[PDB]
Amino acid sequence: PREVILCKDQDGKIGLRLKSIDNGIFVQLVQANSPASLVGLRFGDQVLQINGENCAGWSSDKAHKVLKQAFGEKITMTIRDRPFERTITMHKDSTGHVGFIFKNGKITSIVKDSSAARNGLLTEHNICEINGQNVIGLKDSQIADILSTSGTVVTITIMPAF
Amino acid sequence: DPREVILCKDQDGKIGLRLKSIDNGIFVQLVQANSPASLVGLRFGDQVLQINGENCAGWSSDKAHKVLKQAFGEKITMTIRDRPFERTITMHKDSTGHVGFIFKNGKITSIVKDSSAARNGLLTEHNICEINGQNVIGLKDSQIADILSTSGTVVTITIMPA
Ligand SMILES: CC(=O)c1ccc(F)c(-c2ccc(C[C@@H](C(=O)N[C@@H](C)C(=O)O)N3Cc4cc(Br)ccc4C3=O)cc2)c1
Ligand SMILES: CC(=O)c1ccc(F)c(-c2ccc(C[C@@H](C(=O)N[C@@H](C)C(=O)O)N3Cc4cc(Br)ccc4C3=O)cc2)c1
């Protein structure tokens, strides 16, 4: 658990969208070049507390109601670094592929006798990083450009789509 | 990193394991006490990458059991990824002897407000696997309650999404 302080920029907005998942509050959307982006907030981070109050059981509307109705331009948050994050290493075959089909940044299929198949890569998982580069927010064709310019080793970080 | 385990059948060609297809992968759903599977370290939620050399990718629950049933000699080789969905949460009992969560069939279904569980971001729709190193998979709810009731102030629980 870590504590991040956020300064509200002009319209009392943090550039953050939160979602209620399994009675927890998670980071769902982080706008680029925003107060939230600045202090390290990433897709899949868990918010434990907002201004010292527990987020447990809060609905998605409650979390946003709290963030806007907060007095003063400073909001403290206690965060847990993407708890659902897993890393999987794969190798390109002779055709330059590791073996998976994706749509909207989410793995939808695994090709038989592929590197993804040998390494137990899962479907219904969003891709977060490829070889260190963040891919949340990129269009599918830009993600394919990163995969295409990769060496033989393809390490991807994934999380269940939820 | 995955590890290889060698399993020797006990008498009836039984390995003492129950499998489950999840997200085009195969995971262990139950490990029998004192069995060949229990002997080599297999635990609930372990991922099976290969059975006797072939990829489990896309295999159904029935397919995995069919392949295990139809194994030739008394030796079944398996490539395992150690419980990939495992998270550990440490909580402290309050003055009334509780950490603050409700469960049914071994699954967290509610988080009590202002509790140690709420402070630690404990999540619902998660199966409880262990409590202070004691495996609780396969136990009745009143037996899980008995383990919590006789625990010290520190309560560390291992969980996995349902
Ligand atoms: C045995 C093995 O490995 C193998 C053997 C033969 C094959 F024809 C393949 C294979 C070839 C191409 C692809 C395409 C696949 C892809 O390039 N995936 C990467 C991650 C990869 O497999 O390396 N993309 C590209 C793409 C772009 C955009 Br815009 C949107 C979606 C996608 C997508 O799913 C998929 C499979 C695979
Ligand atoms: C502030 C705080 O903590 C707190 C405040 C007020 C509270 F009324 C509680 C609290 C009291 C009791 C329980 C019961 C709850 C329980 O004992 N859970 C443990 C894990 C715990 O909370 O320590 N079980 C026991 C049980 C047995 C069987 Br059989 C089936 C289901 C369950 C179940 O969910 C739950 C909450 C707690």
Curated annotation (Swiss-Prot), chain B:
Cysteine-cysteine disulfides: none
Membrane topology: Peripheral membrane protein
Listed GO CC annotations: adherens junction; azurophil granule lumen; blood microparticle; cytoplasm; cytoskeleton; cytosol; endoplasmic reticulum membrane; extracellular exosome
Post-translational modification: Phosphorylated on tyrosine residues.
Gene Ontology biological process terms from the UniProt entry: actin cytoskeleton organization; chemical synaptic transmission; intracellular signal transduction; negative regulation of receptor internalization; negative regulation of transcription by RNA polymerase II; positive regulation of cell growth; positive regulation of cell migration; positive regulation of cell population proliferation
Tissue specificity note: Expressed in lung cancers, including adenocarcinoma, squamous cell carcinoma and small-cell carcinoma (at protein level). Widely expressed. Expressed in fetal kidney, liver, lung and brain. In adult highest expression in heart and placenta.
Domain PDZ: 4-83, 88-162
Keyword Cytoplasm: yes
Signal peptide limits: none
Membrane-spanning ranges: none
Keyword Secreted part of the UniProt annotation: yes
Residues engaged in binding a 1,2-diacyl-sn-glycero-3-phospho-(1D-myo-inositol-4,5-bisphosphate): N105, K140, D141
Induction: By IFNG/IFN-gamma in melanoma cells.
Keywords associated with the record: Acetylation, Cell junction, Cell membrane, Cytoplasm, Cytoskeleton, Endoplasmic reticulum, Lipid-binding, Membrane, Nucleus, Phosphoprotein, Repeat, Secreted
Known outcome of mutating N105D: Disruption of the cooperative binding of C-terminal peptides from FZD7 and phosphatidylinositol-4,5-bisphosphate
Location(s), subcellular: Cell junction, Focal adhesion; Cell junction, Adherens junction; Cell membrane; Endoplasmic reticulum membrane
Top-level taxon of the source organism: Eukaryota
Coiled coil (UniProt feature): none
GO molecular function: cytoskeletal anchor activity; frizzled binding; identical protein binding; interleukin-5 receptor binding; phosphatidylinositol-4,5-bisphosphate binding; protein heterodimerization activity; protein sequestering activity; syndecan binding
Role of this protein: Multifunctional adapter protein involved in diverse array of functions including trafficking of transmembrane proteins, neuro and immunomodulation, exosome biogenesis, and tumorigenesis. Positively regulates TGFB1-mediated SMAD2/3 activation and TGFB1-induced epithelial-to-mesenchymal transition (EMT) and cell migration in various cell types. May increase TGFB1 signaling by enhancing cell-surface expression of TGFR1 by preventing the interaction between TGFR1 and CAV1 and subsequent CAV1-dependent internalization and degradation of TGFR1.
Subunit record text: Monomer and homodimer. Interacts with SDC1, SDC2, SDC3, SDC4, NRXN2, EPHA7, EPHB1, NF2 isoform 1, TGFA and IL5RA. Interacts with NFASC and PTPRJ. Interacts with SDCBP2. Interacts with PDCD6IP. Forms a complex with PDCD6IP and SDC2. Interacts (via C-terminus) with TGFBR1. Binds to FZD7; this interaction is increased by inositol trisphosphate (IP3). Interacts with SMO.
Protein name stated in the entry: Syntenin-1
Chain's gene name: SDCBP
Entire protein: shown range: 113 to 272 of 298
